[PDB]
Structure 1
């Protein structure tokens, strides 16, 4: 079981290459995750200088396999069942009244560590919009990630809207259309309609001088009573 790969603490690596309205950049992340608690600890760093977009807009893109599934619903955990071969995660993130990101990533074990390699492309973003104008507050709110089975793809789909608070007191919605596919050929677990109660907390390393992001998250599956 890919399940047995998460009984303890697992090292994590995240590599991301992006291009937003022609502005290229890269961010690396490292840390560890504990699916038993459903928690992650991660430090991200923009290795190409300043991040051309706000850090929060990248949170969802930057390993739901570290979600905590209650004992009664461990059969709905597609994420772990696809390990160690892993899965492909794709998304179309539409910022209300602004541009959109299209992401494609692979989440699989590479040795003793879980790695999330991402490629991101954004287009049609407004010059001085909330995104390119850095008008989002440096924080994050709680969201429910609704998952449904995608039998034809032998994976899953996810649909949700991220709420990014703007410094002007308004909210910038970020519609998310997710699609996950197993990498290997073996059978996986096609969960029932449920969601992931995910929370994130963004902070900074007063000692780090590079553009970065300290992220702590807690995810617990739910929606299926028992």
Structure 2
């Protein structure tokens, strides 16, 4: 495909997010590389406005499916790569069980040769003393699958999944994700059969970085076909 060629090597990533969580304005910037060949993502984020009002783990999913590693036999299902270099719109609604919910809009594309992801995030209905606002979430993350199906009508895709965040007392916090992807151009794309993505992430810190931030490593491989 058209965009397949762009992911042949290691790609520079640039991430910019603007959010407001219950009137808690903030900004985050990340940089890192991408190696679609191994389904590898390596990023670092800094909350440029100070202290991040919410828990890092809550942004993980928000913070590049085009870096998925598609087995050769599944190449014809890669929608992300197909949408490039034009890019696509990734829209999201993330509901936290018994709490607020994030609404996301992001544009992912190429700028010159840097893969860019701009996000506008809006979050409301959070309990000030909730798990989120009250930062009860442990700095860790579990493995999982993201389910993918076509969106013929829309010439896009619909993805649905759930994340389970650990709470400091042993409990679990639910995050149900709703997701639509549409391509930015009027270009042709790849509409896939149903499959999913297998995710593995590890969060970490930068011993030397004083600023509020998050180092995130992630492996993603496509399956179910």
Structure 1 length normalisation: TM-score?
Answer: 0.99
Query: Distance in 2 between the 1:209 and 1:152 partners?
Result: 48
Query: Distance in 2 between the 1:118 and 1:129 partners?
Result: 24
Cα distance, 1:179 vs structure 2: 0.3
Query: Distance in 2 between the 1:102 and 1:169 partners?
Result: 27
Aligned residues between the structures: 224
Cα distance, 1:143 vs structure 2: 1.3
1:31-82 CA-to-partner distances (Å, cap 9, x unmatched) read 1000010101100000000000000000111110000000000000000000
Cα distance, 1:152 vs structure 2: 1.0
Q: For residues 85-104 of structure 1, what are the structure 2 equivalents within 5 Å? A: 85-104=86-105
- Residue equivalent to 2:222: 221
Structure 2 length normalisation: TM-score?
Answer: 0.99
1:116-152 CA-to-partner distances (Å, cap 9, x unmatched) read 0000000000011000000000011101000000111
Aligned-pair RMSD on alpha carbons?
0.4
Query: Distance in 2 between the 1:202 and 1:36 partners?
Result: 21
1:93-137 CA-to-partner distances (Å, cap 9, x unmatched) read 000000000000000001111000000000000011000000000
- Residue equivalent to 1:37: 38
Cα distance, 1:10 vs structure 2: 0.4
Q: Which runs of 4+ in 1 moved over 6 A?
A: none
Query: Distance in 2 between the 1:61 and 1:215 partners?
Result: 12
1:41 partner SS: strand
Query: Distance in 2 between the 1:151 and 1:109 partners?
Result: 25
Gaps of 5+ in 2: none
